[PDB]
Ligand binder design. Structure first.
Ligand SMILES: NC(=O)c1ccc[n+]([C@@H]2O[C@H](COP(=O)([O-])OP(=O)(O)OC[C@H]3O[C@@H](n4cnc5c(N)ncnc54)[C@H](O)[C@@H]3O)[C@@H](O)[C@H]2O)c1
Ligand SMILES: NC(=O)c1ccc[n+]([C@@H]2O[C@H](COP(=O)([O-])OP(=O)(O)OC[C@H]3O[C@@H](n4cnc5c(N)ncnc54)[C@H](O)[C@@H]3O)[C@@H](O)[C@H]2O)c1
Ligand SMILES: NC(=O)c1ccc[n+]([C@@H]2O[C@H](COP(=O)([O-])OP(=O)(O)OC[C@H]3O[C@@H](n4cnc5c(N)ncnc54)[C@H](O)[C@@H]3O)[C@@H](O)[C@H]2O)c1
Ligand SMILES: Nc1ncnc2c1ncn2[C@@H]1O[C@@H]2COP(=O)(O)OP(=O)(O)OC[C@H]3O[C@@H](O[C@H]2[C@H]1O)[C@H](O)[C@@H]3O
Ligand SMILES: Nc1ncnc2c1ncn2[C@@H]1O[C@@H]2COP(=O)(O)OP(=O)(O)OC[C@H]3O[C@@H](O[C@H]2[C@H]1O)[C@H](O)[C@@H]3O
Ligand SMILES: Nc1ncnc2c1ncn2[C@@H]1O[C@@H]2COP(=O)(O)OP(=O)(O)OC[C@H]3O[C@@H](O[C@H]2[C@H]1O)[C@H](O)[C@@H]3O
Lengths: 473, 473, 473
């Protein structure tokens, strides 16, 4: 289904930002607390007991750690050992980290010591450049896909982690290049603050400096904060007081032009990220098909149909990936060229002709999987081919359909074209929840109109375009 | 009972360190002064009289011995003879040495010339590798269980013992490998300084070097020092001055990140060590039982009970040792596997099936004693077996109970299961101080709830788990 | 087959050292040059060209880098960028790294900046603690399986890497704790220097210090160096001069008691490591079988046979892992107990009784795979079981055989026992190269004697023992 209109507007804006590679993610400690790591308060629980305090009655953990260091003549051995033993455990990644790794985001700023972001980026075969030291800023990893600025330290270097109040006090001098880099990113990139509480003194100082430098012309940043929920045993008045206090905090965040999105549940973050990826993943379509006969239409009429379909798809800011199949590939190229020339960007039209010969047939399967992996939505037209002097049904269209379905791609079999596409349409229609879960009345009507053979070229193309649009957004 | 919260926190931390085999013991001369050896001042009393001085009016015994050597043109014959005659006597070990030998500690550093630590380690059938010479460091005894670095010399080699000031002055050159080894251990292992005064120049030099090398990132070490007590004839003001001076000394110790635990009595050291061993000894439980009938519950319900009990025990970081008894062993295995697979560590589940046949029955007794010796807590379920076509009471459960009781293991007879376990529960209940000395109201309530047959599976399992928890800690 | 007697003696000694966890690996840059990284000379080739020099005509690359830094007023930007871009590439691990990760080795010392060792250790699900900074020495990762001391720096921190001569000059002051740690390890552990040239000034200084401290009582260390091979265009006399110079260098290495093993090829390193692992992997046997009938022998005679076989296996320092199968498990336990009691070590006898019940049968497969994974050699006896009132063939023995074969374990089906073991023996005999590649005449004779049903108990046990011995070594 869908979400609140505010969340939908945020999704549209951030998908617009990400596709231009001008988006950054600021991940706090809260993004990793769902993985399985104990909260920092629970880590400091024995430490507070040692100096005679209690974490449950303490609001400032930084001052708690500073008191612990003061008792031990400024020694951090126990704190370093605690953070090293806790944040270096072997835990499975959450879905949020994998989604963020799949997104085309080239900048991560983290206040968490764990390497979950690095691991998520490396699992997706993405070269990630982690920077948590001043000297590391002067060297850039070659062909990096994303840079993770760990602005508070790494788990493998506990002595450098910003935990106590002296660390924050000397941060402005020791880690000044990181402050300058974050100040530059907060004005040159659009941030999405996920799992961040906005209570960090370093972030307060940096944001205040940015606001003082730019006043009302600050760049718009987005934030995700869960609304306060009533505790199991609490009066109504205190819950309303907490909600009022959270509303004031959210309004105060927008002083730095950081728009806050209220989230009912923590699991809504994953649903937002999935939507953001889907609006990007489905932006590329895969025009599958091959035809020597064109069913009810004549060859010229169907060629015009395919040409105009590709022209409309390109006109609506879609990316066409075509295998240059016999009978549809040339007309797809013609439509794309007619729309574009009214040079060719490598992102608009992607041609992958299949090598002809017994040597290329062995690599055909991986070639086809590589093609389909580039796309998010698959559209199937006709699907017959001439074999043994007869118009047989082309099994490559079925193979593409199977590969796209294995990849959880949205399949749109145009049944009006006929042949193997009609069979695909019937197969999808028999079990509609399997291929299109949670569909609406409009989606079902459009799908049932895909097999309406009495439609003209324009009506069928409009049906397909509306179907792809409601799929993408 | 219990002790101060500071001591309890130290006990928890050090038990955590020992179970990971990252703990070391630094034993000074004070740990042996309880055995029966005369103090070093009393040994030097005739020597001081010889050169015209008096030990009671002298604070530095090292300089006293150096003066004695200076008078005799640098000859140490009398001092060597004195230390050889005093520290080679035949004395009985204290409880502290035996407890330290029973603990899983692989490193001992000693400034005492006596071989009490070696003897304690050898009494427990532990291969101990004593090192007091530079050449001995290059050779490691095969399959050693603990290495004792006698950093000041052995009693059987009085000429090499560090007694006079020239020995300390040339220690940095002669015994440099020992200094390097102690510097490595002070940063790679957690030390417990027992019976040490922290006035040794070698230790001061080594600790200062470690602090200069690591500054505030030094590893946390623990110390045990008795609080100053008022002498029989002393003013209040001088006693308060001594206490203030001791507090300043304790605070100065933490400059090297050595946390000091204030002990009211010397005998509290034994009570701390017993607690440290008990938190380790009781970490392993022995699930005893055998069932062909399952009392009030059905066979499936009781199988689920045993399965979930084992799953909860493993989930709470306990080690299950099972004799694979008929009716409980398979379900214990099922629970352990379900918890672990959500490979098998050799420490989590230990299976010792009893060999069936007249040849194995003769070794059954030693086999059972070996099994129970591995554990610290014994839990008994049901205990009937099919014999002569009838459900007789199984005497093996009673034998296990007797063996565990002979070993001072905590016995937890689950009386709700019934049969021989109900008899065991009644036997423990009749004389409760015999099996559970110094019990509290909560422990008595939990024990009386073990026979509450109206409890469900979850309630009974929670009762058993809480009982085992309050036993372990 | 086998190798030179010197290499065999080294293999025996080092396998003896590794099994006692007293062995360490010192890996130089040469161990990674087979992975695909370009040599350090090729990295410095543009740098030398920049300052007017040439690497091919230069023997000291450290001085070359120092000259490059001197030209640029002591700036290392280009060198840091070069090492970061080269040693952070994504390359596949070699077999040597995987073998070293599988070995029970708890200490690695590396002069290579790449993280290949860390990756190899993490692929085997081993917790590895990488240390390349002074502060990192004071913190130990909990439950680490191996510690990798990167004594020259990490690739992700190029500014700290020891590349130029100033770095070596200030190493003795900056990285002094690493020098002390390596000095301690060079006297407390047996090292295997793989892929190291022994031209590093730091290693020369450390080894000279160790020799000066211990003189002729230094611990024995092992090294692997490839013999010099004639270049494609070179005179005989210069090749003989190079060989003489290498022999002198090898002899000079033994001054520090570092025995050097001459290797004809680089690929002989993998063959040595495979032998070292095989002598450790095959030290544990898996006694598979289940019997209600005992073929030609009577029940008592076959029970004595199994008992004595287990007793002999334990007597020859083997580890027995038994699934407590019906008919062989009890007698295996009896034999092991009789041999050991003449406590039970967790490594000598490992019992894994199979949970009986429909709940445990679902986990039986993973349980059996976990059991067999612990072992290196599988021995199969009988293999029948009572089903439907008849002595059917037990399929669990066949399943174990299949699992062991999938794991490349040596299978020893005792065909004299009969039943499913005779079928296993015939199956192995039909295609002998598949299960025992590169066998000798003695191995074939022993295998053909395993089915000699006329053998007595002692003769059959001796045959099995000799077979397992020639397999292990
Ligand atoms: O200071 P800091 O912000 O670095 O650390 P923190 O622990 O203070 O982070 C708290 C923030 O993280 C979010 N958060 C907390 N637990 C979470 C979870 N399980 N899943 C997702 N988000 C969560 C909260 O919304 C909050 O805004
Ligand atoms: O110098 P050194 O420290 O090697 O020798 P030392 O004799 O100076 O040792 C004194 C230390 O040992 C402890 N100690 C003294 N007598 C003891 C006893 N009977 N039992 C337990 N602890 C005792 C004291 O607390 C003191 O800290
Ligand atoms: O100085 P350093 O020793 O650190 O670096 P280095 O490059 O000087 O290392 C050379 C050493 O590594 C070994 N080596 C070189 N190439 C190798 C390869 N491809 N496979 C295995 N071993 C190889 C050589 O035997 C030589 O002893
Ligand atoms: N002389 C040719 N010149 C150029 N291209 C040719 C020729 N001859 C055949 N082709 C095309 O090769 C592909 C593999 O051949 P195929 O296995 O027979 O394909 P198919 O079963 O018709 O599947 C159809 C899908 O495959 C791909 O185009 C097909 C053919 O149209 C597309 O992705 C389609 O959408
Ligand atoms: N065919 C069998 N297969 C497997 N195992 C069997 C069989 N037949 C009997 N057993 C078990 O042998 C042990 C010795 O036998 P037992 O002397 O008769 O034992 P018990 O009196 O019931 O004591 C119970 C305690 O002993 C041990 O399990 C018992 C039996 O359950 C445990 O530690 C119990 O906790
Ligand atoms: N009352 C029982 N008490 C104890 N143990 C029992 C009983 N009843 C059966 N067992 C054993 O369970 C295992 C699984 O049963 P199974 O699948 O029938 O085994 P199998 O086909 O005979 O394979 C044989 C191999 O499996 C394992 O022992 C077998 C049985 O002997 C070993 O590893 C063998 O080497």
């Amino acid at each position: 289904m869908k979400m609140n209109p505010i969340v939908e507007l945020f999704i549209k804006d951030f998908t617009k930002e990400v596709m231009e590679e001008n988006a950054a993610i600021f991940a706090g400690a809260g993004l990793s607390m769902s993985v399985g790591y104990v909260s920092w308060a629970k880590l400091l629980e024995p430490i507070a007991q040692e100096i005679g305090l209690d974490v449950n009655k303490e609001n400032d953990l930084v001052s708690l750690a500073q008191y612990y260091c003061n008792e031990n003549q400024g020694n951090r051995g126990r704190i370093n050992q605690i953070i090293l033993d806790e944040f270096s455990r072997k835990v499975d990644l959450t879905e949020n980290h994998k989604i963020l790794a799949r997104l085309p985001i080239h900048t991560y700023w983290t206040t968490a010591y764990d390497r979950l972001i690095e691991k998520a980026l490396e699992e997706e075969n993405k070269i990630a450049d982690v920077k948590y030291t001043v000297k590391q800023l002067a060297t850039t990893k070659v062909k990096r896909d994303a840079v993770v600025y760990k602005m508070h330290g790494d788990v493998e270097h506990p002595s450098e982690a910003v935990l106590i109040k002296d660390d924050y006090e000397k941060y402005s001098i020791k880690m000044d290049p990181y402050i300058k880099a974050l100040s530059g990113d907060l004005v040159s990139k659009t941030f999405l603050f996920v799992g961040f509480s906005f209570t960090d003194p370093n972030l307060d100082y940096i944001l205040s400096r940015v606001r003082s430098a730019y006043e009302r012309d600050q760049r718009r940043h987005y934030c995700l904060i869960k609304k306060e929920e009533r505790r199991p045993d609490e009066l109504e008045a205190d819950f309303e007081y907490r909600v009022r206090k959270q509303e004031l905090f959210i309004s105060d965040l927008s002083r730095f032009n950081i728009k806050t999105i209220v989230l009912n549940n923590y699991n809504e973050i994953t649903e937002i990220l999935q939507r953001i990826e889907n609006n990007i993943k489905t932006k590329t379509v895969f025009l599958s098909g091959s035809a020597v006969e064109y069913n009810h239409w004549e060859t010229e009429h169907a060629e015009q149909f395919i040409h105009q379909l590709s022209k409309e798809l390109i006109r609506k800011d879609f990316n066409i990936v075509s295998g240059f199949g016999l009978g549809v590939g040339s007309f797809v190229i013609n439509g794309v060229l007619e729309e574009l020339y009214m040079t060719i960007d490598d992102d608009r039209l992607i041609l992958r002709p299949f090598p002809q010969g017994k040597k290329g047939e062995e690599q055909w399967d991986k070639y086809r999987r590589d093609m389909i992996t580039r796309t998010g939505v698959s559209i199937f037209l006709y699907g017959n081919k001439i074999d043994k002097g007869q118009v047989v049904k082309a099994k490559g269209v079925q193979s593409e359909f199977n590969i796209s379905f294995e990849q959880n791609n949205y399949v749109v079999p145009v049944g009006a074209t006929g042949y193997i596409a009609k069979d695909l349409w019937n197969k999808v229609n028999e079990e509609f929840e399997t291929y299109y879960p949670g569909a609406d009345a409009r989606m079902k009507k459009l799908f049932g109109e895909l097999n309406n053979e009495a439609l003209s070229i324009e009506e069928l193309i409009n049906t397909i375009i509306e179907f792809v649009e409601i799929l993408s957004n």
